[PDB]
Design a protein around this nucleic acid. Structure first.
Ligand SMILES: [Mg+2]
Ligand SMILES: [Mg+2]
Lengths: 104, 288, 285, 108, 259, 285
DNA sequence: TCGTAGCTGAGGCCTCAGCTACGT
DNA sequence: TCGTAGCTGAGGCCTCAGCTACGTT
């Protein structure tokens, strides 16, 4: 039960660089990553198989640019995120709860 | 694939975009990635959705349930195909011997009675419980003596009183039925995935309905609803309905591991289907 | 309970009002009373609909079918309480005798060969055409001698040259295949409507063998169009192929549109497979 | 599990709109550098902490120097996790400041 | 409470910037946060540093060691003021009774001889070891060079801790600065000497440079003290602060270090 | 083993070459032979030095002192092997008799009162000045009658008005205190050089009471400068106070610079506190 | 050849509303 | 009232080299 934390700093210098970024960022959205903060994304992943799978997919869609970096946080750790200022993203996509209501 | 049970009950508009379900209501909007979704329950009549989304919901084998204006479930999406190539399993299902169907159905109804008994024991009816094991022991192929129904009567009498009958028209039955429909839709799904038709029950084929086979496979799991409803037998219907979603959250002992209900159903179903095809010899077991 | 098979394939919004299905939007609007509806087929991914309507569609035990982006059926609504009358056809399909499946399949294949021949004759190959009739006459149950394939070879050789094979990767085959997929999706649709499963053909992979089997005699309709445009680029064949949905074709003595034919043909073939009728319906070109 | 030589991960998005906003940021970013945080990546900093007590201490200091702007967010990663950081592209920062070893040579 | 022992060997310039030590060479550059630093060892004569940095190194009570051209230690920074108000402990140290200094010094020297014995026992000299316990109820080579290096390390540690408590290191409990400016550190470190003896014994076969490295173990290893595994400098702090208490007569009972 | 006390306070770089200390600043460069050096005092935070030099400074057992940014001493190099001769002064300071500390402290306080009086006389208060001499004459060991404080009150009243108190928060006091801190850091420095600890004054919270005690007679030097600029803003008093480091003052029979006086005064006071001499040295304004 | 605090402007990083071109 | 992919330009986020003012109640 985990959260993959993906962090990039990618170049914008040239139009190939930018294209590569837009492609990559698309891949991320399609893959169900949530922007927590600019340049910083998180995908909730269920178990080990999902992870090794996701990592392989990332490697295939690697835009060989910039600094792109991944961390594996446990759900426990990620939900304990201290908000020094500003408030939490309450989208359901960002929780780990089994049952979900769209307005009860 | 997934784990989320997504319940919708606000006036809203469901769509699809980039592998996400898209929910839009006036206050707010939400995006949920399909790979995370196990079940989509459309509780109300104020919801509007797109065929695009429904295609995709079928692709990712998501259980979709529709409800009436009293928020009771009245139907499901039934995909025609898949896993591909489902054809293989079809030709095998048609080949299922009458004798074997019998062994399996009876083995399964036996697990139910057992679980009914365990449930009674769990409520300190050591006696009535032991009586149901007696009935189990007297089962023959396809239960022509209807031990199933006798067990069922005694079971429910002991749990809810001698006045109680499964018919009709109280809160307790309404909840029991809601729960059973949930179980039904789960196994219906899994069966179709294996490449079977849910129309064909092991004992009655499709004489009475289009989902008998799911109805047959879910038998041993019935007491899971019985437990929840018994515990909330004092409560109003809306509270039973919610407490029943426990089935999708809780974890249950199966093959020596604590597993989630839908995962169990998948294994159980796929494995039952194997022993019906005669690729294997011992029905899998669910105990409570 | 009704009679109408309501097919939707325009970008639209379905709703419910006063016992009517409500279909919008501009250019076109329409109201249809639910008691008149037997089947609602949602052919495309363009449509949007309401849970209110779906509740009511379930109340009146209307068969609701969904399709994918290639307009093939992929599922239906399954009510928990009650049943549409297509459910009955399943029990019958499972009962289809091996002998009868044979008679029907062979009868159908025979119509194809005939139509292949007529097509050749129409291109002034009086000779090669007559040869295919010879092959037709030598058909036995389930064509174990594979006259079908011989007819097919000769047919295509005469039409597109001895160098031509149907395996080879060119514009002509691409179009032929596009056209056949169109025919397939049509019959797939109709079969499911009748309450059948498309997955198992009459002669035995594919999820649509049975559609593949029923559409056999209609193949030459594509063959004609492609032959006529054999000189053109693929995109032009693709467009000229939409003719199938516009043109009208001789069937049961009347000029009818292709989908109407398919509906009759299918529903009637299914009858003779159930043994409620004798005599397969005929399509000629 | 351990947190022994845990790593606090601090992530901000702070407004630049007005000069008070910018001042607040520069103050905050200074606090961070002075407190021994390392820029891993642009809006993203990490401070190695020795145990849990050091953390509760650091958190209290952060709260006192809170700029009251933007979205500022903290996560506790275990040493194990942090050293397993997968570099999908680009390469690691080999500063000593970024290791957890007690004995350190400036050219051995 | 810092933990890093930072050793410098390369021609370089040390600076200070934003609570960091700043190290600059060819083309290696490095920043290290002072709060992480326990000890700074300046091994060579090719290093240049600033009085700013040194002020800050004294503020954060970091041990700074200087070396000669053979890379042996020859001195350390001795702060004058090691707490707030250190003056309080000074007036108490001057008040230390001759009788009590005796009890404490003897108690400490006893711990040393015990630990020497335990060390002998650990090398299977059950006999000679037992002989040293009897005593308790009553040249110019690589081995000594290492022993002395090690002892200087221990000395600088306790010197530091003593000053922090507000004491003067010059005044030994028996000998009160007659021989040394650090007799009191020399006195407190006595029971810890065998820690060096062990390391040197184990490497008695090796060249001096290998003994020197193996000795840094003292700053990384952990040792049994007051029932807990602790790092050497943390022990030294507790041990020292607690010894000072029993000399002021704010408690009874010298703390104990065993090996 | 040497005689020079080498004070550094300019932004600079210290090196070693051929038995010399090497000093380099933007323009100024200077070489000094280590055998001539008794003490090296690093007064400021702008100085850079080498471990080579420090090794050699330890070899020749030179006392090396470091300071903080207020130019107060905070530590020294402690060699492991030998000893500079300032070590000996510690054992002597601990031996300072209570009776003698009294004689010296009182002698010193008396010089202060005298200088306060001379300052008043210099401002044409011949009268109030003579009154302070009366107070001086009534001093006893450790001033239990607090004539010091009475002199201080009257002194400041006459100089800055009867509404003036030294506890009030104004520009005049801010400058007076700045000035006193300057004097303090000077004597703190000199005391440590002699081998003493600054922490404990002759008469008993501060880390520098003893410096505070020795600087007493020099306080009026600040009082003069501030009085003269009592009309000005604080920043102007601060600058005019740097005069202390430039001006020359009568001491012994010679015009000397303040720090040179402080060095002599301090070393000599320390001598009479060790009882190697009789007769406290005198500073008059 | 020592530090700090505080601001600025050059220059790269990052997202998003809005548009075009497209799709059995 | 269905979806996709890809680019642009407006506008906010973020760092760093480089400059000025300052330096013992
Ligand atoms: Mg970034
Ligand atoms: Mg950011």
């Amino acid at each position: 039960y985990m959260r993959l934390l993906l962090m990039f700093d990618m170049p914008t210098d040239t139009a190939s660089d930018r294209k590569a970024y837009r492609k990559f960022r698309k891949f991320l959205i399609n893959e169900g990553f949530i922007m927590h903060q600019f340049s910083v994304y998180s995908k909730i992943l269920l178990n080990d198989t999902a992870n090794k799978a996701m990592l392989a997919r990332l490697k295939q869609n690697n835009p060989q640019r910039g600094l792109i970096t991944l961390l594996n946080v446990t759900e426990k750790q990620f939900s304990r995120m201290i908000y020094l200022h500003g408030e939490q993203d309450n989208r359901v996509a960002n929780s780990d709860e089994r049952i979900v209501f769209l307005g009860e | 694939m997934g784990w989320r049970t997504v319940v919708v009950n606000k006036h809203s508009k469901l769509s699809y975009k980039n592998n996400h379900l898209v929910f839009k209501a006036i206050d707010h909007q939400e995006l949920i990635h399909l790979s995370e979704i196990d079940v989509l329950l459309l509780e109300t009549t104020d919801i509007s959705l797109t065929t695009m989304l429904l295609k995709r919901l079928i692709d990712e084998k998501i259980l979709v349930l529709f409800c009436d204006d009293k928020r009771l479930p009245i139907g499901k999406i039934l995909p025609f195909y898949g896993r591909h190539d489902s054809s293989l399993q079809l030709t095998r299902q048609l080949a299922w011997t009458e004798e074997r169907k019998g062994q399996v159905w009876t083995a399964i109804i036996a697990q139910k009675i057992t679980n009914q008994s365990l449930h009674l024991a769990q409520r300190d009816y050591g006696q009535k419980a032991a009586a149901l094991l007696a009935m189990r022991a007297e089962l023959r192929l396809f239960d022509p003596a209807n031990r199933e129904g006798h067990a069922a009567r005694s079971y429910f009498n002991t749990l809810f009183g001698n006045d109680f009958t499964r018919e009709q028209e109280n809160d307790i039955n309404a909840g029991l039925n809601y729960g059973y429909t949930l179980l039904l839709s789960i196994f219906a799904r899994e069966l179709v995935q294996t490449g079977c038709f849910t129309q064909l029950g092991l004992k009655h084929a499709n004489q009475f309905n289009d989902f008998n086979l799911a109805s047959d496979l879910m038998e041993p799991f019935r007491p899971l609803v019985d437990q929840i409803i018994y515990e909330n037998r004092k409560e109003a219907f809306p509270i039973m309905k919610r407490k029943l979603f426990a089935l999708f959250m809780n974890t249950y002992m199966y093959k020596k591991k604590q597993m989630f209900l839908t995962n169990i159903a998948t294994d159980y179903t796929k494995h039952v289907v194997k022993v019906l095809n005669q690729e294997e010899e011992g029905v899998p077991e669910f105990g409570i």
